[PDB]
């Protein structure tokens, strides 16, 4: 007794472990735990593929579960490591199952850089192995029937998921064995054979002839359609074709023999004979043309016995007329069977080794959220500094707030005195002088490292080239040159960063020495500074003039505005929203993540409160400045211009310009310092990447 099954596909073994490990690490903090269980698992994945595929050997649900275990893992991994972003050189290689192509060869292989191909083949192998476990079952037994019926339905379904999967996944022309048509015929053969089994159960349980006829008819339909699909495409092993033919016929004959007992029960004797006669024919033909592939004797003996007896009873007793087949009513059909849908996990006891790993669909979303947060926050900071710079400059250019706290021309206007004591407290000129002094040294410290590093590479290369020169035979590894170009290109990059930093140092030095002398003035004790400021007679009617109080309250409010920018910049900076979860959600509930629109709305709930105010700050400045210059220009027409207060005037404006510069310089200087300090960090790692690669090589 003989059922069709499919042979597995052969693969060459590949290293899964290590092209995955490259991404794993280049994505996570090297040496941490979020990488510990991700290299331990990737090796256990490479192991698993080996046991799943590495040998066409084992032949039970020991080895099937291993394959199913493998399919489930291979599917769980696709939404991680960027497969859908072709850069991983994991190339999978399978051979046709049947030794088939669309040319007259004797085998054909196909290697592809796609997980989609990998998974189509594994499933085909899951289906084929299932087909083999099913065809082996002892069908006299209830566990036998149950297991055949379940595996055939599994196989049919696995083959059909392939039919619907292949072309969209695999971006090439597949081998014949996994093409839609082949795999669609295989699916139907498996479905047919599942019916066959349900027919055999019903027979064994002695169910009604009505039921049995209909199950057999249905099997016959299924084998027929499969036969037809085979008739003009020879893409299956040569034995599939005759065997479908015989099974179709046997199924028809089984259908008729049962329908014929039913007719005898209803006393349609001519009919019984007509159906018996058709069964005898089908079996006669089967026995003689498909002997090789079937045994049909018992059935044939039983048909003949029924036929002789029915003809005896008829010829002598009943005298019923025997109809032509065309006038017989169709036997009905009953399927009891379905293609099993494929829904991972298809394996018992499944656990996703890499469950913890975050989907790439999120990484890209999470990293691209940052570059929109950054763009929003920096943008807003910059606008605000650019505005404060401009206001302070305009104020200076109009001697404000100095001019209105300037009772006589005799003392240090309160504001200047505040700014002075402010300068003196922050350390005065020493704090700017000491930061200028150490800047060439932080530059030099970073040059040292870049150079010590590349010279390592140079020295090692000089000798590798000499060893190749003098020991041709004994010394052959890829030259240092090639191994080193990646590092050396980081090298020339760093160089560019240094050249920009030097230019930046240039701007700060020139500014610093362009503004030193005045700053030094501002830092003097109160009377010493008062002596150095020229005195003037005041324009005395500045008692309580309306232009003065207006300017005053307007300055109080411009002040207000700029002191508020500090707490804005701090709230802009001190908050953030972790977005992972929002993406995780949008991925689980919906199909994909669209961060574009999902971030724009969250950036608005998080930052909108502050971005609103930042804009309200600028317009409020523009407002306050427009009607301060008009209010000033009128103020000046009230306080005349002579030499003694022009002199006081410039010194005053220049002392205010001096305050701005000190504050700005400290900030540029500290920025330079921080930069040169973070840069040493980056360059020490680079120094070690260099020495490690000279110590390995």
């Amino acid at each position: 007794a003989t059922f069709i099954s499919v042979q597995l596909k052969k693969t060459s073994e590949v290293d899964l472990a290590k092209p995955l490990v490259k991404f794993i690490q280049q994505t996570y903090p090297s040496g941490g735990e979020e990488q510990a269980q991700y290299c331990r698992a990737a090796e256990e994945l490479s192991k698993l593929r080996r046991a799943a595929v590495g040998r066409p050997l084992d032949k039970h649900e020991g080895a099937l579960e291993t394959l199913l275990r493998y399919y489930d893992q291979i599917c769980s991994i696709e939404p991680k490591f960027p497969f859908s972003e072709n850069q991983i050189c994991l190339t999978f290689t399978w051979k046709d199952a049947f030794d088939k192509g669309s040319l007259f060869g004797g085998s054909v292989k196909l290697a592809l850089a796609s997980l989609g191909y990998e998974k189509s083949c594994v499933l085909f192998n899951c289906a084929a192995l299932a087909s083999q476990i099913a065809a082996e079952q002892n069908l006299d037994n209830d566990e036998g029937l149950k297991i055949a019926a379940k595996h055939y339905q599994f196989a049919s379904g696995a083959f059909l998921h392939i039919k619907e999967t292949v072309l969209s996944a695999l971006s090439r022309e597949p081998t014949v064995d996994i093409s839609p048509d082949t795999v669609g015929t295989l699916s139907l053969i498996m479905l047919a054979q599942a019916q066959e089994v349900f027919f055999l159960k019903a027979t064994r349980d002695k169910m009604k002839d009505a039921i049995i006829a209909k199950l057999a008819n249905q099997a016959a339909d299924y084998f027929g359609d499969a036969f037809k699909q085979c008739q003009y495409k020879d893409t299956l092993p040569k034995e599939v074709f005759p065997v479908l033919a015989a099974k179709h016929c046997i199924m028809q004959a089984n259908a008729e023999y049962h329908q014929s007992i039913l007719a005898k029960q209803q006393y349609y004797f001519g009919e019984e004979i007509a159906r018996l006669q058709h069964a005898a024919e089908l079996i006669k033909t089967v026995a003689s043309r498909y002997d090789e592939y079937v045994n049909v004797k018992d059935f044939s003996d039983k048909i003949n016995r029924a036929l002789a007896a029915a003809k005896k009873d008829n010829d002598f007793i009943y005298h019923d007329r025997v109809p032509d087949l065309k006038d017989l009513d169709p036997i009905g059909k009953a399927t009891l069977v379905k293609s099993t849908p494929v829904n991972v996990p298809i394996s018992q006891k499944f656990t996703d080794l890499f469950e913890k790993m975050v989907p790439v669909s999120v990484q890209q979303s999470l990293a691209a959220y940052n570059q929109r947060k950054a763009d929003l926050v920096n943008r807003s900071i910059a606008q605000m500094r650019e505005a404060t710079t401009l206001a302070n400059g305009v104020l200076a250019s109009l001697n404000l707030p100095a001019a209105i706290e300037d009772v006589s021309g005799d003392t240090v206007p309160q504001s200047i005195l505040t700014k002075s004591r402010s300068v003196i407290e922050q350390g005065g000129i020493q704090t700017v002088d000491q930061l200028i002094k150490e800047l060439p040294e932080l530059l030099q410290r970073n040059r040292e490292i870049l150079d010590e590093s590349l010279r390592l590479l140079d020295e090692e290369e000089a000798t590798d080239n000499d060893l190749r020169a003098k020991f041709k035979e004994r010394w052959q590894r890829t030259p240092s040159n090639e191994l080193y170009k990646p590092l050396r290109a980081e090298g020339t990059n760093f160089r560019t960063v240094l050249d920009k930093a030097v230019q930046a140092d240039g701007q700060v030095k020139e500014c610093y020495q362009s503004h030193r002398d005045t700053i030094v003035l501002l830092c003097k004790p109160e009377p010493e500074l008062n002596a150095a400021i020229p005195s003037a007679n005041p324009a005395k009617t500045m008692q309580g003039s309306e232009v003065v109080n207006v300017l005053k309250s307007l300055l109080s409010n411009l002040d207000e505005v700029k002191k508020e920018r500090e707490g804005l910049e701090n709230d802009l900076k001190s908050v953030n929203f972790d977005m992972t979860s929002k993406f995780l959600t949008a991925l689980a509930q919906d199909g994909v993540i669209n961060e574009e629109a999902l971030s724009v709305t969250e950036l608005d709930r998080v930052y909108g409160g502050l971005t609103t105010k930042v804009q309200e700050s600028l317009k409020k400045q523009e407002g306050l400045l427009k009607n301060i210059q008009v209010s000033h220009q009128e103020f000046s027409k009230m306080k005349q211009s002579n030499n003694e207060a022009n002199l006081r005037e410039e010194v005053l404006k220049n002392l205010a310009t001096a305050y701005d510069n000190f504050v700005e310089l400290v900030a540029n200087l500290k920025e330079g310092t921080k930069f040169y300090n973070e840069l040493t960090e980056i360059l020490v790692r680079f120094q070690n990447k260099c020495s490690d690669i000279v110590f390995a090589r």
């Binding site: 990059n493 560019t496 960063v497 920009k500 930093a501 930046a504 701007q507 700060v508 540029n668 920025e671 330079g672 930069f675 973070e678 840069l679 980056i682």
Partner: peptide
């Protein structure tokens, strides 16, 4: 932009 903290932080 004064000192290149752009180039710096990406590396």
């Amino acid at each position: 932009e004064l000192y290149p903290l752009t180039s710096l932080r990406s590396l």
